[PDB]
Amino acid sequence: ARDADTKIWNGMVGELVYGKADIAIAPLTITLVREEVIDFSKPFMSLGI
Amino acid sequence: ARDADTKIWNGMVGELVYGKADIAIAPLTITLVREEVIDFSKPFMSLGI
Amino acid sequence: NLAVLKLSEQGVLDKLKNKWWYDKGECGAKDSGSKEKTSALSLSNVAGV
Numbered sequence: 001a002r003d004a005d006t007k008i009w010n011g012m013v014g015e016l017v018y019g020k021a022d023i024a025i026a027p028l029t030i031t032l033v034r035e036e037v038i039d040f041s042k043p044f045m046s047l048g049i
Numbered sequence: 050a051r052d053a054d055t056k057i058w059n060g061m062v063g064e065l066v067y068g069k070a071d072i073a074i075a076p077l078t079i080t081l082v083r084e085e086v087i088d089f090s091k092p093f094m095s096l097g098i
Numbered sequence: 099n100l101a102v103l104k105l106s107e108q109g110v111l112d113k114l115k116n117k118w119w120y121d122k123g124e125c126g127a128k129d130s131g132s133k134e135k136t137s138a139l140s141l142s143n144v145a146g147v
């Protein structure tokens with residue numbers, strides 16, 4: 001997730017935001033706050049809380 | 050769908066390909082061959098046959 | 099974007115999901131939920147009588 005007041009995305013987000021990692025095939029959830037910094041394909045498996 | 054042997058999209062997808070429409074809020078199923086001519090958003094409702 | 103739709107079209111996602119969730123039915127109720135035992139009456143059943 002992002003940091004408060006500095007927007008530092010850690011974790012698997014910042015690996016793609018900050019140019020570290022090239023692609024991420026992983027259980028990652030399409031949100032609203034993630035489309036602004038990275039892009040997602042069409043979803044391949046559905047779920048819920 | 051496309052016509053046999055001519056690749057002429059009738060129906061609503063042809064209305065987006067041939068410049069006659071602008072957007073299609075509709076019960077429209079994301080297939081493969083519809084991706085190569087017109088863009089889709091993320092899915093909003095899931096179903097099956 | 100064009101690749102994940104091929105796997106959705108050809109059921110490869112279904113095959114992988116079956117392999118990694120349903121072929122490894124291990125614990126209890128999934129396997130033994132459709133079997134039958136006859137009876138043997140013990141005293142814990144009939145006590146209030």
Ligand SMILES: NS(=O)(=O)c1cc2c(cc1Cl)N[C@H]([C@H]1C[C@H]3C=C[C@@H]1C3)NS2(=O)=O
Binds near residue numbers: 046106115
């Ligand atoms: N039954 S499931 O959760 O494993 C599952 C879920 C999905 C699959 C395929 C499977 Cl097998 N592909 C769909 C895609 C197909 C087309 C329609 C939406 C997307 C495009 N997304 S999905 O709805 O996320």
Ligand SMILES: NS(=O)(=O)c1cc2c(cc1Cl)N[C@H]([C@H]1C[C@H]3C=C[C@@H]1C3)NS2(=O)=O
Binds near residue numbers: 031043046093
């Ligand atoms: N239960 S359903 O089919 O009506 C349905 C199906 C979908 C919904 C919302 C609903 Cl209510 N939104 C999802 C999107 C929302 C976010 C999370 C995945 C995608 C992004 N697409 S979806 O999986 O197509």
